Design a protein around this ligand. Structure first.
Ligand SMILES: [Cl-]
Ligand code: NA
Ligand code: NA
Length: 129
């Protein structure tokens, strides 16, 4: 599923992301825009052989099991394919674990390079929230 910007913002708010660990909703929407273009079915393979999955491009090296990343962890306790669902619940629950991990949203390279220090509230402007 390809989300609309405001559709995703509302789904994220409902799942408890607005101000989760101090990151306002605009940050999560911005990160999703640049990670996956709001497409839950986004996959991208990394040089190390790991793969990123879903709307927040969560990586199989640490966070999920895809059966092909030798010597990886499954810290969110899910098959990576659960991250591609049109229901963002698994992606959101796993993102909460990631952002608590010490580096905050800097774990998402596109957030750090494209969202951090920008006016992220623009991403939720005009939405009925
Ligand atoms: Cl932080
Ligand atoms: Na915001
Ligand atoms: Na594996």
């Amino acid at each position: 599923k390809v989300f609309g910007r405001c559709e995703l913002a509302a789904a994220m708010k409902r799942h408890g992301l607005d101000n989760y660990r101090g990151y306002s909703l605009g940050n999560w929407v911005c990160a999703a825009k640049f990670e996956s273009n709001f497409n839950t079915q986004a996959t991208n393979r990394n040089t190390d052989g790991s793969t990123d999955y879903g709307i927040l491009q969560i990586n199989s090296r640490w966070w999920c099991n895809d059966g092909r990343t030798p010597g990886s962890r499954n810290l969110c306790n899910i098959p990576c394919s659960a991250l591609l669902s049109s229901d963002i619940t698994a992606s959101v629950n796993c993102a909460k674990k990631i952002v608590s991990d010490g580096n905050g949203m800097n774990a998402w390279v596109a957030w750090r390079n494209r969202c951090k220090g920008t006016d992220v509230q623009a991403w939720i402007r005009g939405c009925r929230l």
